Ligand SMILES: Nc1ncnc2c1ncn2[C@@H]1O[C@H](COP(=O)(O)OP(=O)(O)OP(=O)(O)O)[C@@H](O)[C@H]1O
Ligand SMILES: [Cl-]
């Protein structure tokens with residue numbers, strides 16, 4: 001092709017390409033190495049990635065995300081029925097299959113989850129093409145290890161619709177392991193633990209690798225735990241702060257809340273590198289500017305329980321895998337949330353000081369591995 005590797009995440013997608021023995025994680029038109037898994041529909045256009053997320057606050061009903069949560073599932077699924085209650089966009093039943101319903105150019109339209117995902121994949125494909133200066137056709141697309149045959153099929157279909165020849169659908173933890181060369185043959189089998197904390201889901205996977213062959217020993221986690229939840233904690237904290245400082249509640253102003261959330265998400269990323277972050281919002285509510293800051297210590301306290309809770313699925317995974325902590329040869333960090341220092345501390349302490357594989361940006365590790373595998377399969 002060269003063939004590319006694409007990580008189609010619930011919240012962000014990432015694309016990489018293996019060239020000259022090196023993986024290049026490709027930045028998009030805005031210079032971002034990951035792109036929001038968002039698609040928006042308006043009176044005049046269809047927006048994807050950054051363009052879509054940048055307007056979610058003003059067009060909540062027609063801005064779609066979380067397609068990964070619906071992909072390959074049935075409308076009558078308990079989780080689909082539960083998820084629908086929290087999404088601002090509509091989900092309808094088409095002969096037992098879920099479809100997102102939106103308004104586009106003044107008309108009601110509906111798209112299958114794979115159609116929405118194909119739009120995101122198209123964006124990733126174009127991002128790669130802009131970088132390579134060549135047409136990209138072949139690709140390896142990743143999925144969570146617990147995905148079933150239908151969810152994998154629908155994911156492959158999204159690729160095909162986007163014009164990609166999906167060489168293979170591989171598990172996210174396996175892709176992460178490959179990124180670190182943990183698939184190389186060293187004689188005996190090795191047990192690897194993948195700790196994946198993304199924007200919306202937490203996945204712990206224990207893999208056993210031997211002769212380049214992977215075996216998913218066990219999986220654990222929480223499909224509703226991620227960076228988004230950490231943002232929510234900060235949002236509530238600041239809503240309370242604004243109320244104290246202005247005797248005004250912004251909670252019911254959907255937009256004001258979203259703008260605060262975006263500011264919180266950005267502050268959070270900064271706290272992974274510095275011990276303090278500033279938040280300065282203009283015209284947050286009724287023309288009132290909100291200039292404040294938050295410390296890393298404060299951020300950690302607001303999320304203490306959630307952070308500490310990530311260890312439970314780790315213990316469960318080990319138990320189900322019938323392995324003690326000491327039997328894990330490597331710990332791989334995946335997902336943007338694992339960049340949080342407190343999370344790294346908790347996991348390392350749990351593993352009695354064992355070092356964490358974290359040299360590859362956690363939110364890029366999956367695409368990195370997928371790119372390596374795509375090259376191999378080309
Ligand atoms: N430096 C950072 N510190 C803390 N959190 C970060 C940092 N960079 C990114 N994040 C968070 O990482 C999350 C996105 O992670 P990732 O890119 O792995 O998502 P994803 O694969 O779509 O995840 P999932 O499928 O779980 O939603 C967001 O919540 C984002 O705020
Ligand atoms: Cl772009």
Ligand SMILES: [Cl-]
Nearest residue numbers: 342345346349
């Ligand atoms: Cl601690």
Ligand SMILES: [K+]
Nearest residue numbers: 007009012013
């Ligand atoms: K991702």
Ligand SMILES: [K+]
Nearest residue numbers: 196198201202
């Ligand atoms: K995840």
Ligand SMILES: [K+]
Nearest residue numbers: 144201202203
């Ligand atoms: K997941």
Ligand SMILES: [Mg+2]
Nearest residue numbers: 009010198335
């Ligand atoms: Mg992910």
